[PDB]
């Protein structure tokens, strides 16, 4: 190994986002489909594995609401015995999360690389 020259393949940085954590800067030696490409970044992170694990397109929140209801229509709720609502217990969220699978490339599915990548298992056993 002494002639190997970076620049070889068309490397760009992606913006991937370890499974429930947070998004790391890592650069993507992309040349063939998704498949390729996140392969590459699972060994950045030390990943092996994609039967139960897929990936989402991860949608940058640009539009957060300030709701918590309508407020100025009726100002509050005309009982209050029960507050089910305080703190959000359960980070659930599927509209962050637009699936994405591998058998083509992120330009055949209009995706560029400006879209956070988000690793998810939407096949998660570890219910013990």
């Known amino acids: 190994s002494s002639g190997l020259v970076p620049r070889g393949s068309?490397?760009?940085?992606?913006?991937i986002r370890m499974l429930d954590g947070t998004v790391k800067t890592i650069m993507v030696d992309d040349s063939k489909t998704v498949?390729?490409?996140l392969m590459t970044i699972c060994a950045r992170i030390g990943?092996?594995?994609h039967d139960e694990y897929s990936l989402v397109r991860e949608l940058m929140?640009?539009?957060?609401?300030?709701?918590?209801?309508?407020?100025?229509?009726?100002?509050?709720?005309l009982r209050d015995e029960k507050k089910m609502e305080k703190l959000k217990?359960?980070?659930?969220?599927?509209?962050?999360?637009?699936?994405?699978?591998?058998?083509?490339t992120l330009r055949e599915q209009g995706?560029?690389?400006?879209e956070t990548l988000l690793l998810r298992r939407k096949f998660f056993y570890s219910d013990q």
């Open 47 to 49: 990943i092996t594995n």
């Open 61 to 77: 929140e640009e539009k957060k609401d300030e709701g918590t209801g309508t407020l100025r229509k009726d100002k509050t709720l």
């Open 35 to 37: 498949t390729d490409m």
């Open 10 to 15: 068309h490397m760009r940085p992606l913006k």
């Open 111 to 114: 995706v560029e690389e400006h």
């Open 89 to 104: 217990q359960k980070l659930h969220t599927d509209d962050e999360l637009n699936w994405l699978d591998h058998g083509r």
